[PDB]
Coordinates of C-alpha atoms and ligand atoms in Angstrom, one line a residue:
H3 CA 45.6 -38.5 17.6
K4 CA 48.4 -36.3 16.3
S5 CA 47.6 -36.1 12.5
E6 CA 44.1 -34.6 11.8
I7 CA 44.4 -35.5 8.1
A8 CA 45.1 -39.2 8.8
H9 CA 42.3 -39.5 11.4
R10 CA 39.8 -38.2 8.8
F11 CA 41.1 -40.4 5.9
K12 CA 40.8 -43.6 8.0
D13 CA 37.3 -42.8 9.2
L14 CA 35.6 -42.0 5.8
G15 CA 37.6 -43.9 3.3
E16 CA 39.3 -42.7 0.1
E17 CA 36.3 -42.4 -2.1
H18 CA 34.3 -40.3 0.3
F19 CA 37.6 -38.4 1.1
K20 CA 38.1 -37.4 -2.5
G21 CA 34.4 -36.6 -2.8
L22 CA 34.3 -34.0 0.0
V23 CA 37.6 -32.4 -0.9
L24 CA 36.3 -31.9 -4.4
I25 CA 33.2 -30.3 -2.8
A26 CA 35.3 -28.0 -0.6
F27 CA 37.3 -26.8 -3.6
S28 CA 34.2 -26.4 -5.7
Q29 CA 32.5 -24.2 -3.1
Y30 CA 35.7 -22.2 -2.6
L31 CA 36.6 -21.7 -6.3
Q32 CA 33.3 -21.9 -8.2
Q33 CA 34.6 -20.6 -11.5
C34 CA 37.7 -22.7 -11.7
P35 CA 37.5 -25.6 -14.3
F36 CA 36.7 -29.1 -13.3
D37 CA 40.0 -30.6 -14.3
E38 CA 42.1 -28.2 -12.2
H39 CA 40.2 -29.3 -9.1
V40 CA 40.8 -33.0 -9.7
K41 CA 44.6 -32.4 -9.6
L42 CA 44.2 -30.5 -6.3
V43 CA 42.0 -33.4 -5.0
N44 CA 44.5 -36.0 -6.3
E45 CA 47.5 -34.1 -4.9
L46 CA 46.1 -33.7 -1.4
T47 CA 44.9 -37.3 -1.5
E48 CA 48.4 -38.8 -2.1
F49 CA 49.7 -36.6 0.8
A50 CA 47.0 -38.0 3.1
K51 CA 48.0 -41.5 2.2
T52 CA 51.6 -40.6 3.1
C53 CA 50.5 -39.4 6.5
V54 CA 48.5 -42.5 7.3
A55 CA 51.7 -44.6 6.5
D56 CA 54.0 -42.1 8.4
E57 CA 52.4 -39.7 10.8
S58 CA 55.7 -38.1 11.9
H59 CA 56.2 -37.0 8.2
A60 CA 56.5 -33.3 7.7
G61 CA 53.2 -31.4 7.6
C62 CA 50.9 -34.2 8.9
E63 CA 50.2 -32.4 12.1
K64 CA 48.9 -29.2 10.6
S65 CA 45.2 -28.2 10.7
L66 CA 42.9 -29.2 7.9
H67 CA 42.3 -25.5 6.8
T68 CA 46.0 -25.0 6.6
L69 CA 46.6 -27.8 4.0
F70 CA 43.5 -26.7 2.2
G71 CA 44.6 -23.1 2.3
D72 CA 48.1 -24.0 1.3
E73 CA 47.0 -25.7 -1.9
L74 CA 44.5 -22.9 -2.6
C75 CA 47.3 -20.3 -2.5
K76 CA 49.3 -22.0 -5.2
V77 CA 46.6 -21.5 -7.9
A78 CA 48.3 -19.4 -10.5
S79 CA 45.0 -17.8 -11.6
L80 CA 43.8 -16.8 -8.1
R81 CA 44.2 -13.0 -8.5
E82 CA 43.3 -12.5 -12.1
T83 CA 40.1 -14.6 -11.7
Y84 CA 38.8 -13.9 -8.2
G85 CA 40.3 -10.4 -7.5
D86 CA 40.5 -9.5 -3.8
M87 CA 40.4 -13.2 -2.9
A88 CA 44.2 -13.2 -3.6
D89 CA 44.8 -11.0 -0.6
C90 CA 43.5 -13.8 1.7
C91 CA 46.8 -15.6 1.2
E92 CA 48.6 -12.8 2.9
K93 CA 46.9 -13.7 6.2
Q94 CA 47.7 -16.3 8.8
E95 CA 45.3 -18.9 10.0
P96 CA 42.5 -18.8 11.0
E97 CA 42.0 -15.2 9.6
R98 CA 43.0 -16.6 6.2
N99 CA 40.3 -19.2 6.1
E100 CA 37.6 -16.8 7.2
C101 CA 38.8 -14.5 4.3
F102 CA 38.0 -17.3 1.8
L103 CA 34.5 -18.1 3.3
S104 CA 33.5 -14.4 3.0
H105 CA 33.9 -14.7 -0.8
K106 CA 31.5 -17.6 -1.4
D107 CA 29.2 -16.3 -4.2
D108 CA 25.5 -17.1 -3.7
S109 CA 24.7 -15.8 -7.3
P110 CA 27.6 -17.4 -9.2
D111 CA 26.3 -16.4 -12.7
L112 CA 27.0 -19.9 -13.9
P113 CA 25.4 -21.2 -17.1
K114 CA 22.2 -23.3 -17.0
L115 CA 22.8 -27.0 -17.7
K116 CA 20.7 -28.2 -20.6
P117 CA 21.2 -32.0 -20.3
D118 CA 20.8 -34.0 -23.5
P119 CA 20.3 -37.7 -22.8
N120 CA 22.3 -39.1 -25.7
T121 CA 25.6 -37.3 -24.9
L122 CA 24.9 -37.7 -21.2
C123 CA 24.5 -41.5 -21.2
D124 CA 27.6 -41.6 -23.3
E125 CA 29.6 -39.8 -20.6
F126 CA 28.4 -42.2 -18.0
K127 CA 29.6 -45.4 -19.6
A128 CA 32.9 -43.8 -20.5
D129 CA 33.8 -43.5 -16.8
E130 CA 31.4 -44.1 -14.0
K131 CA 33.6 -42.4 -11.5
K132 CA 34.4 -39.3 -13.5
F133 CA 30.7 -38.6 -14.2
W134 CA 30.1 -39.1 -10.5
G135 CA 32.7 -36.3 -9.8
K136 CA 31.3 -34.0 -12.5
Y137 CA 27.8 -33.9 -10.8
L138 CA 29.5 -33.1 -7.5
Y139 CA 31.6 -30.3 -9.0
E140 CA 28.6 -28.8 -10.8
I141 CA 26.1 -28.9 -7.9
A142 CA 28.6 -27.6 -5.3
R143 CA 29.8 -24.7 -7.5
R144 CA 26.4 -23.2 -7.8
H145 CA 25.4 -23.8 -4.2
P146 CA 28.5 -23.1 -2.0
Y147 CA 26.7 -23.7 1.2
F148 CA 25.3 -27.2 0.4
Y149 CA 25.1 -29.8 3.1
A150 CA 28.2 -31.7 1.8
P151 CA 27.4 -35.3 3.1
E152 CA 24.0 -35.1 1.5
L153 CA 25.5 -34.1 -1.9
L154 CA 27.3 -37.5 -2.0
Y155 CA 23.9 -39.1 -1.2
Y156 CA 22.4 -37.2 -4.2
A157 CA 25.4 -38.2 -6.3
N158 CA 24.9 -41.9 -5.7
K159 CA 21.2 -41.7 -6.6
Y160 CA 22.2 -39.8 -9.7
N161 CA 24.3 -42.6 -11.1
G162 CA 21.6 -45.0 -9.9
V163 CA 19.1 -43.4 -12.3
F164 CA 21.6 -43.8 -15.1
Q165 CA 22.4 -47.4 -14.1
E166 CA 18.7 -48.2 -14.8
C167 CA 17.8 -45.7 -17.6
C168 CA 20.8 -45.9 -20.0
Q169 CA 19.8 -49.6 -20.7
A170 CA 16.3 -48.8 -21.9
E171 CA 15.2 -48.4 -25.5
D172 CA 13.9 -44.8 -24.9
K173 CA 16.6 -43.2 -22.7
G174 CA 14.9 -39.8 -22.8
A175 CA 11.6 -41.1 -21.5
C176 CA 13.5 -42.7 -18.6
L177 CA 16.0 -40.0 -17.6
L178 CA 14.2 -36.7 -17.8
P179 CA 11.3 -37.5 -15.4
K180 CA 13.7 -38.8 -12.7
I181 CA 16.3 -36.0 -12.8
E182 CA 13.6 -33.3 -12.6
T183 CA 12.1 -34.9 -9.6
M184 CA 15.6 -34.9 -8.2
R185 CA 16.5 -31.3 -9.3
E186 CA 13.6 -30.0 -7.2
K187 CA 14.7 -32.0 -4.1
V188 CA 18.4 -30.8 -4.3
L189 CA 17.3 -27.2 -4.6
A190 CA 15.0 -27.6 -1.6
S191 CA 17.9 -29.3 0.3
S192 CA 20.3 -26.4 -0.7
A193 CA 17.8 -23.7 0.5
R194 CA 17.3 -25.6 3.8
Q195 CA 21.1 -25.8 4.5
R196 CA 21.5 -22.2 3.5
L197 CA 19.0 -21.2 6.2
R198 CA 20.8 -23.3 8.8
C199 CA 24.1 -21.6 8.1
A200 CA 22.3 -18.2 8.0
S201 CA 21.1 -18.9 11.6
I202 CA 24.5 -19.4 13.1
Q203 CA 26.5 -16.7 11.2
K204 CA 23.8 -14.1 11.8
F205 CA 21.9 -15.1 15.0
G206 CA 24.2 -17.4 16.9
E207 CA 24.5 -21.0 17.9
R208 CA 21.5 -20.7 20.1
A209 CA 19.4 -20.0 17.0
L210 CA 20.3 -23.2 15.3
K211 CA 20.3 -25.1 18.6
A212 CA 16.6 -24.1 19.2
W213 CA 15.7 -25.2 15.7
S214 CA 16.9 -28.7 16.4
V215 CA 14.9 -28.9 19.6
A216 CA 11.8 -28.1 17.6
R217 CA 12.2 -30.7 14.9
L218 CA 13.7 -33.5 16.9
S219 CA 11.2 -33.4 19.7
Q220 CA 8.6 -33.2 16.9
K221 CA 9.9 -36.3 15.2
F222 CA 10.9 -38.0 18.5
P223 CA 8.2 -37.3 21.0
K224 CA 9.0 -40.5 22.9
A225 CA 12.7 -39.6 23.7
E226 CA 13.1 -37.9 27.0
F227 CA 14.6 -34.4 27.2
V228 CA 18.1 -35.6 28.3
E229 CA 18.1 -37.8 25.1
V230 CA 17.0 -35.0 22.9
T231 CA 19.6 -32.6 24.2
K232 CA 22.3 -35.2 23.5
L233 CA 21.3 -35.4 19.8
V234 CA 21.0 -31.6 19.6
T235 CA 24.6 -31.1 20.9
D236 CA 26.1 -33.4 18.2
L237 CA 23.8 -32.4 15.4
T238 CA 24.4 -28.6 15.9
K239 CA 28.1 -29.4 15.8
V240 CA 27.6 -31.3 12.5
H241 CA 25.9 -28.3 10.9
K242 CA 28.3 -25.9 12.6
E243 CA 31.3 -27.6 10.9
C244 CA 29.6 -28.1 7.6
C245 CA 28.6 -24.5 7.4
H246 CA 32.2 -23.5 8.3
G247 CA 33.8 -25.5 5.5
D248 CA 34.8 -28.3 8.0
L249 CA 33.4 -30.9 5.6
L250 CA 35.6 -33.8 6.6
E251 CA 34.9 -33.4 10.3
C252 CA 31.2 -32.8 9.5
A253 CA 30.6 -36.0 7.5
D254 CA 32.6 -38.1 10.1
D255 CA 30.4 -36.7 12.9
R256 CA 27.2 -37.3 10.9
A257 CA 28.3 -40.9 10.5
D258 CA 29.0 -41.0 14.2
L259 CA 25.6 -39.6 15.0
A260 CA 23.7 -41.9 12.6
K261 CA 25.6 -44.8 14.3
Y262 CA 24.6 -43.7 17.8
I263 CA 20.8 -43.4 17.1
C264 CA 20.5 -46.7 15.4
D265 CA 22.1 -48.4 18.4
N266 CA 19.6 -46.5 20.6
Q267 CA 16.3 -47.0 18.7
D268 CA 14.4 -48.2 21.8
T269 CA 14.8 -44.9 23.6
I270 CA 14.4 -42.6 20.5
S271 CA 11.6 -43.7 18.1
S272 CA 10.0 -46.8 16.8
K273 CA 10.0 -45.8 13.0
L274 CA 13.8 -46.3 12.5
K275 CA 14.1 -50.0 12.0
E276 CA 14.0 -49.8 8.2
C277 CA 16.0 -46.6 8.3
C278 CA 18.8 -48.3 10.2
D279 CA 19.5 -51.1 7.7
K280 CA 20.6 -49.1 4.6
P281 CA 24.3 -48.2 4.0
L282 CA 25.9 -45.1 5.4
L283 CA 24.7 -42.5 3.0
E284 CA 21.2 -43.9 2.5
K285 CA 20.8 -44.4 6.3
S286 CA 21.5 -40.9 7.3
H287 CA 19.2 -39.5 4.7
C288 CA 16.5 -41.9 5.8
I289 CA 16.9 -40.7 9.4
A290 CA 16.3 -37.1 8.4
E291 CA 13.2 -38.0 6.3
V292 CA 11.7 -40.4 8.9
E293 CA 8.1 -40.3 9.9
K294 CA 7.3 -38.9 13.4
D295 CA 6.6 -41.1 16.3
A296 CA 3.3 -41.4 18.2
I297 CA 2.5 -39.0 21.0
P298 CA 2.6 -40.6 24.4
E299 CA -0.9 -41.4 25.8
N300 CA -0.8 -39.7 29.3
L301 CA 1.1 -36.4 28.7
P302 CA 0.8 -33.9 31.6
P303 CA -0.9 -30.7 30.5
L304 CA 1.5 -27.9 29.2
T305 CA 0.2 -25.5 31.8
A306 CA 1.7 -27.6 34.6
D307 CA 5.4 -27.1 34.1
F308 CA 5.4 -23.5 32.7
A309 CA 2.5 -21.5 34.1
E310 CA 1.1 -22.4 37.5
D311 CA 4.4 -23.6 39.0
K312 CA 5.3 -21.0 41.7
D313 CA 9.0 -21.3 40.7
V314 CA 9.0 -20.7 37.0
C315 CA 11.1 -17.6 37.5
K316 CA 13.4 -19.6 39.7
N317 CA 14.0 -22.5 37.4
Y318 CA 14.3 -20.1 34.5
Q319 CA 17.2 -17.9 35.8
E320 CA 19.3 -20.9 37.0
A321 CA 19.5 -22.3 33.4
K322 CA 17.7 -20.1 30.9
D323 CA 18.5 -21.9 27.6
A324 CA 18.0 -25.2 29.4
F325 CA 14.7 -24.1 30.9
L326 CA 13.6 -22.7 27.6
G327 CA 14.9 -25.7 25.7
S328 CA 12.7 -27.8 28.0
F329 CA 9.7 -25.6 26.9
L330 CA 10.3 -26.1 23.2
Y331 CA 10.8 -29.9 23.7
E332 CA 7.5 -30.2 25.7
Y333 CA 5.7 -28.2 23.1
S334 CA 7.2 -29.7 20.0
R335 CA 6.6 -33.3 21.1
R336 CA 2.9 -32.8 21.8
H337 CA 2.2 -30.8 18.6
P338 CA 3.6 -32.4 15.5
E339 CA 0.9 -30.6 13.4
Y340 CA 2.8 -27.3 13.9
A341 CA 5.4 -26.0 11.4
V342 CA 8.9 -25.5 12.8
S343 CA 8.7 -21.8 11.9
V344 CA 5.7 -21.6 14.2
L345 CA 7.0 -23.4 17.3
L346 CA 10.2 -21.3 17.9
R347 CA 7.9 -18.3 17.5
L348 CA 6.0 -19.6 20.5
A349 CA 9.2 -20.2 22.5
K350 CA 10.6 -16.8 21.5
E351 CA 7.3 -15.3 22.7
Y352 CA 7.4 -17.3 25.9
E353 CA 11.0 -16.1 26.5
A354 CA 9.8 -12.4 26.2
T355 CA 7.1 -13.2 28.7
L356 CA 9.5 -14.5 31.4
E357 CA 12.0 -11.6 31.1
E358 CA 9.3 -9.0 31.8
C359 CA 7.0 -10.9 34.2
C360 CA 9.9 -11.9 36.5
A361 CA 10.8 -8.2 36.7
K362 CA 7.5 -7.4 38.2
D363 CA 7.0 -7.9 41.9
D364 CA 4.1 -10.4 41.4
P365 CA 5.3 -12.5 38.4
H366 CA 2.7 -15.2 39.2
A367 CA -0.1 -12.9 38.2
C368 CA 1.9 -12.0 35.0
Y369 CA 2.9 -15.4 33.5
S370 CA 0.0 -17.6 34.6
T371 CA -2.0 -16.4 31.6
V372 CA 0.8 -16.5 29.0
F373 CA -0.8 -19.5 27.2
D374 CA -3.8 -17.4 26.4
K375 CA -1.6 -14.9 24.6
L376 CA 0.3 -17.8 23.0
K377 CA -2.8 -19.5 21.7
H378 CA -3.6 -16.3 19.7
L379 CA -0.3 -16.6 17.7
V380 CA -1.4 -19.7 15.9
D381 CA -4.5 -18.2 14.4
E382 CA -2.9 -15.0 13.0
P383 CA -1.5 -16.6 9.8
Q384 CA -4.7 -18.7 9.3
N385 CA -6.4 -16.3 6.9
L386 CA -3.3 -15.5 4.8
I387 CA -3.2 -19.0 3.3
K388 CA -6.9 -18.9 2.2
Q389 CA -6.6 -15.5 0.4
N390 CA -3.4 -16.8 -1.2
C391 CA -4.8 -20.2 -2.2
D392 CA -7.9 -18.7 -3.6
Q393 CA -5.9 -16.3 -5.8
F394 CA -3.6 -19.3 -6.6
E395 CA -6.3 -21.6 -8.0
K396 CA -8.0 -18.6 -9.8
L397 CA -4.9 -17.5 -11.9
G398 CA -2.6 -20.5 -11.8
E399 CA 1.1 -20.8 -11.2
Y400 CA 2.4 -18.6 -13.9
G401 CA -0.3 -16.0 -13.3
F402 CA 0.3 -16.2 -9.6
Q403 CA 4.0 -15.5 -10.1
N404 CA 3.1 -12.2 -11.8
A405 CA 0.6 -11.5 -9.0
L406 CA 3.3 -11.5 -6.3
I407 CA 5.8 -9.9 -8.6
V408 CA 3.4 -7.0 -8.8
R409 CA 2.6 -7.0 -5.1
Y410 CA 6.1 -7.3 -3.7
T411 CA 7.7 -4.9 -6.2
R412 CA 5.4 -2.3 -4.7
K413 CA 6.5 -3.2 -1.2
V414 CA 10.3 -3.1 -1.8
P415 CA 11.1 -1.3 -5.0
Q416 CA 14.8 -0.6 -4.2
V417 CA 15.6 -4.3 -4.6
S418 CA 17.5 -5.2 -7.7
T419 CA 15.6 -6.7 -10.6
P420 CA 17.0 -10.2 -10.9
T421 CA 16.3 -10.7 -7.1
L422 CA 12.6 -9.7 -7.3
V423 CA 12.1 -12.0 -10.2
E424 CA 13.8 -15.0 -8.7
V425 CA 12.2 -14.6 -5.3
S426 CA 8.7 -13.9 -6.7
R427 CA 8.9 -17.1 -8.8
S428 CA 9.8 -19.2 -5.8
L429 CA 6.9 -17.8 -3.7
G430 CA 4.4 -18.7 -6.4
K431 CA 5.6 -22.3 -6.4
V432 CA 4.7 -22.5 -2.7
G433 CA 1.1 -22.5 -3.9
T434 CA 1.6 -25.6 -6.0
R435 CA 3.4 -27.1 -3.0
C436 CA 1.0 -26.3 -0.3
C437 CA -2.5 -25.2 -1.4
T438 CA -3.3 -28.6 -2.8
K439 CA -2.6 -30.2 0.5
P440 CA -5.5 -30.7 3.1
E441 CA -6.8 -27.5 4.6
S442 CA -5.6 -28.0 8.2
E443 CA -2.1 -28.6 6.8
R444 CA -1.9 -25.8 4.2
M445 CA -0.6 -23.3 6.9
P446 CA 2.4 -25.5 8.1
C447 CA 3.5 -26.1 4.5
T448 CA 3.4 -22.4 3.6
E449 CA 5.3 -21.0 6.6
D450 CA 8.0 -23.7 6.3
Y451 CA 8.8 -23.0 2.7
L452 CA 8.4 -19.2 3.1
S453 CA 11.2 -19.2 5.7
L454 CA 13.4 -21.0 3.1
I455 CA 12.6 -18.4 0.4
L456 CA 12.6 -15.3 2.5
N457 CA 16.1 -16.4 3.7
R458 CA 17.1 -16.5 0.1
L459 CA 16.0 -12.9 -0.4
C460 CA 18.0 -11.8 2.7
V461 CA 21.0 -13.9 1.6
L462 CA 21.0 -12.2 -1.8
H463 CA 20.2 -8.8 -0.3
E464 CA 23.0 -8.7 2.4
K465 CA 25.6 -9.1 -0.3
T466 CA 24.4 -5.8 -1.9
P467 CA 22.1 -4.0 0.6
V468 CA 19.9 -1.4 -1.2
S469 CA 16.7 -1.6 0.7
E470 CA 16.3 -0.7 4.4
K471 CA 12.9 -2.3 4.7
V472 CA 14.4 -5.7 3.7
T473 CA 17.5 -5.3 6.0
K474 CA 15.1 -4.5 8.9
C475 CA 13.0 -7.7 8.5
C476 CA 16.1 -9.8 7.9
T477 CA 18.1 -8.8 10.9
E478 CA 15.3 -8.0 13.5
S479 CA 14.6 -11.6 14.1
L480 CA 15.0 -15.0 12.6
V481 CA 11.5 -16.3 13.2
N482 CA 9.3 -13.3 12.5
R483 CA 10.5 -12.7 8.9
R484 CA 7.2 -14.0 7.3
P485 CA 5.0 -11.6 9.3
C486 CA 7.5 -8.8 8.9
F487 CA 7.4 -9.1 5.1
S488 CA 3.6 -9.6 5.1
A489 CA 3.2 -6.5 7.2
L490 CA 5.1 -4.4 4.8
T491 CA 3.2 -1.7 2.8
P492 CA 3.9 0.1 -0.4
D493 CA 5.6 3.2 0.8
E494 CA 5.3 6.7 -0.8
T495 CA 8.9 7.4 0.2
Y496 CA 10.2 5.7 -3.0
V497 CA 10.8 7.9 -6.0
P498 CA 9.8 6.1 -9.2
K499 CA 12.5 5.0 -11.6
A500 CA 13.2 7.2 -14.7
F501 CA 12.2 5.7 -18.0
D502 CA 14.6 3.3 -19.6
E503 CA 13.9 2.4 -23.2
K504 CA 16.4 -0.5 -23.2
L505 CA 14.4 -2.2 -20.5
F506 CA 11.3 -2.4 -22.7
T507 CA 12.9 -3.1 -26.2
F508 CA 12.2 -6.7 -27.5
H509 CA 14.0 -8.7 -30.2
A510 CA 13.2 -11.8 -32.2
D511 CA 15.2 -13.8 -29.6
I512 CA 12.2 -13.9 -27.3
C513 CA 10.6 -16.4 -29.8
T514 CA 13.6 -18.7 -29.4
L515 CA 14.7 -18.7 -25.7
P516 CA 13.7 -21.7 -23.5
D517 CA 10.4 -21.5 -21.8
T518 CA 11.9 -20.6 -18.3
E519 CA 13.9 -17.9 -20.0
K520 CA 10.8 -16.6 -21.9
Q521 CA 8.9 -16.2 -18.6
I522 CA 11.9 -14.7 -16.8
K523 CA 12.4 -12.2 -19.6
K524 CA 8.8 -11.2 -19.4
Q525 CA 8.7 -11.0 -15.6
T526 CA 11.9 -9.0 -15.7
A527 CA 10.3 -6.4 -17.9
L528 CA 7.2 -6.5 -15.6
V529 CA 9.3 -5.7 -12.5
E530 CA 10.9 -2.7 -14.4
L531 CA 7.4 -1.6 -15.3
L532 CA 6.4 -1.1 -11.6
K533 CA 9.8 0.4 -10.7
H534 CA 8.8 3.2 -13.1
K535 CA 5.0 3.3 -12.4
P536 CA 4.8 2.1 -8.8
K537 CA 1.1 3.2 -8.5
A538 CA -0.4 1.8 -11.7
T539 CA -3.7 0.1 -10.8
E540 CA -4.6 -3.5 -11.3
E541 CA -7.0 -2.7 -14.1
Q542 CA -4.2 -0.9 -16.1
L543 CA -1.7 -3.7 -15.4
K544 CA -4.3 -6.1 -16.6
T545 CA -4.6 -4.1 -19.9
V546 CA -0.8 -3.9 -20.4
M547 CA -0.3 -7.7 -19.9
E548 CA -2.9 -8.6 -22.6
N549 CA -1.4 -6.0 -24.9
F550 CA 2.1 -7.6 -24.4
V551 CA 0.8 -11.2 -25.1
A552 CA -0.8 -10.1 -28.3
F553 CA 2.4 -8.3 -29.1
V554 CA 4.6 -11.4 -28.7
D555 CA 2.3 -13.8 -30.5
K556 CA 1.9 -11.4 -33.4
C557 CA 5.6 -11.0 -34.1
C558 CA 6.7 -14.6 -33.5
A559 CA 4.5 -15.6 -36.5
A560 CA 5.1 -13.0 -39.2
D561 CA 7.5 -13.7 -42.1
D562 CA 10.0 -11.1 -40.8
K563 CA 10.3 -11.2 -37.0
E564 CA 12.8 -8.4 -36.9
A565 CA 10.6 -5.9 -38.8
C566 CA 7.6 -6.8 -36.7
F567 CA 9.3 -6.0 -33.3
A568 CA 10.8 -3.0 -35.1
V569 CA 7.4 -1.5 -35.9
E570 CA 5.1 -2.9 -33.1
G571 CA 7.7 -2.3 -30.3
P572 CA 7.4 1.5 -30.2
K573 CA 3.6 1.2 -30.6
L574 CA 3.4 -0.8 -27.4
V575 CA 5.5 1.7 -25.4
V576 CA 3.2 4.6 -26.5
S577 CA -0.1 2.9 -25.6
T578 CA 1.5 1.7 -22.3
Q579 CA 2.9 5.2 -21.4
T580 CA -0.5 6.7 -22.3
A581 CA -2.6 4.2 -20.3
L582 CA -0.3 4.5 -17.3
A583 CA 0.7 8.2 -17.4
Ligands
LIG601 C1 34.9 -47.5 5.5 N1 36.1 -47.8 6.3 C2 37.4 -48.1 5.7 C3 35.9 -47.9 7.8 C4 36.6 -48.9 8.4 C5 36.5 -49.1 9.8 C6 35.7 -48.1 10.5 C7 35.7 -48.2 11.9 C8 34.9 -47.3 12.6 C9 34.8 -47.5 14.1 C10 35.5 -48.5 14.6 C11 35.5 -48.7 16.2 C12 36.3 -47.9 17.0 C13 36.3 -48.2 18.3 N2 35.6 -49.2 18.8 C14 35.6 -49.5 20.3 C15 34.8 -50.0 18.0 C16 34.8 -49.8 16.6 C17 34.3 -46.3 12.0 C18 34.3 -46.2 10.6 C19 35.1 -47.1 9.8 C20 35.2 -47.0 8.5
LIG602 C1 29.6 -45.0 -10.3 N1 28.9 -45.9 -9.3 C2 27.5 -46.2 -9.4 C3 29.7 -46.3 -8.2 C4 29.7 -47.6 -7.8 C5 30.5 -48.1 -6.7 C6 31.3 -47.2 -6.1 C7 32.1 -47.6 -5.0 C8 32.9 -46.7 -4.4 C9 33.8 -47.2 -3.2 C10 33.6 -46.6 -2.0 C11 34.5 -47.1 -0.9 C12 35.8 -47.5 -1.2 C13 36.6 -47.9 -0.2 N2 36.2 -48.0 1.1 C14 37.0 -48.4 2.2 C15 34.9 -47.6 1.4 C16 34.1 -47.1 0.4 C17 32.9 -45.4 -4.8 C18 32.2 -45.0 -5.8 C19 31.3 -45.9 -6.5 C20 30.6 -45.4 -7.5
LIG603 C1 -14.2 -18.5 1.5 N1 -14.2 -19.9 1.3 C2 -14.8 -20.8 2.3 C3 -13.8 -20.4 0.0 C4 -12.6 -21.1 -0.1 C5 -12.2 -21.7 -1.3 C6 -12.9 -21.4 -2.4 C7 -12.5 -21.9 -3.6 C8 -13.2 -21.7 -4.8 C9 -12.7 -22.3 -6.1 C10 -12.3 -21.5 -7.1 C11 -11.8 -22.1 -8.4 C12 -12.6 -22.7 -9.2 C13 -12.2 -23.2 -10.4 N2 -10.9 -23.1 -10.7 C14 -10.4 -23.7 -12.0 C15 -10.0 -22.5 -9.9 C16 -10.5 -22.0 -8.7 C17 -14.4 -21.0 -4.8 C18 -14.8 -20.5 -3.5 C19 -14.1 -20.7 -2.4 C20 -14.5 -20.2 -1.2

């Protein structure tokens, strides 16, 4: 086992090999053209084939990141295009590789793909392998933290849609509904992975480890604790390597894990038979999306192991993370109706109970009643969903977006405008994704997605920190972000923004831009409105909104759009400044 490059090549095969290397280069250099990365992939691939033939050949024993870093440093346009990135190549390993990772851009400013089915189906028949790569390069360059083995899965189902749609009479009718159903899933998968990496890089291995204990024991209530711990150890390693750019080691270990569980179905879960007959990529995705198993019939009451035992303090101190891991497992298995975001909050609260109770001279009097305290955590969110689902159904998606945009801009005005827009749009979609579900399931849906969206706000905010209120809730804890943001109030410590005419001038292009761009442009001007008038009441904001709708509709219809915006524009500013100031 003397050549890491050869060990990886043999295990995944050339096609997967080229795929993940193109991913790694796409996430490292997101602005570099597609063709330049293919040569890098092709060059490194031939060298790998040389090492499989001869392992004693020069350079075959070097670490993966070295070879990757070596080829990255030869890019003639490294400095002039990525700036300070070009000083990474002055470092040794592993400080050099860490210098690259720190430059992954979560807001790459990349154009928005407008796929046209005619030219797109033409590119597929031209070369089925090249089109496969183009999707890889385009998805990975806008999401540099994507779970790489899943991107290949999405890439195969991509060509699969084309395989069946480019042969129909109405291509457009076949392609566009399938790809949009996919586009939502890949963004949801990118946000999930971005939160997993955020856990380790900002809260430690124990944070991602405890997340796996939650979901696994939830999905696999039959597997005993020793079995769950085994899967957790290897799964956390899989995510640890993927989040660290160790894509080749990540995929290989995901394949090794998917192989282990299928050969151990009887001791894990009974709903994996169908999941364990698909090919490699399909199988692993099936495993992650598998239905949960049935709760055992005669489970001992939770109070037994963690409340009345006169040795809870003893068993805790000897193996804290193991004793706590046992608690999450026992609680996650018996309660699959809880959201993951909820269960770790119960374990984190139980942890805080043990540290302080065992300090007291009579810990037994202190921790025996912890479950009464814990039971009260589940009901605290319960009324937030209702107030949000009622507002939701009343105003609708688009109106609900502007509702939170108004509410949350008043809470954290210092945040930059493109962030408040993007985040407030995603939060409103949680209504369409959760408030139509059954009532007793509306709360698990919300908290799950909220933790994926609030992590985006933090991820976008830690790059350019401008708000202390946001930094506090993002770094205090990983589980209590949703209550920490919901508990924020509009503070009178924020000075309103000075008036900017350019942020309220409109042109005839508003009648041309795509629908998403029309709404984003309108919501961007809305955010700037509150940054200037943070205390404008809801009745006045209602007035301005209708005045702006009538403004846009009027001028998108006249014979001369330019002269209409010319005249009516200033009029709107006057009436708005009068009504609000
Ligand atoms: C796609 N491809 C070329 C291949 C070919 C062969 C592969 C073998 C293994 C494990 C092989 C083994 C190793 C050790 N024992 C005791 C049994 C089996 C894993 C992935 C593979 C991938
Ligand atoms: C465009 N498209 C639908 C298709 C169809 C079939 C494809 C097969 C491969 C081979 C993958 C492999 C090759 C060699 N070993 C040892 C294992 C796996 C790669 C991409 C494909 C793309
Ligand atoms: C406090 N409570 C038990 C609840 C809960 C949910 C409720 C929903 C509605 C529907 C409101 C609507 C009606 C029609 N459109 C088109 C949208 C929304 C009315 C009262 C409610 C009262």
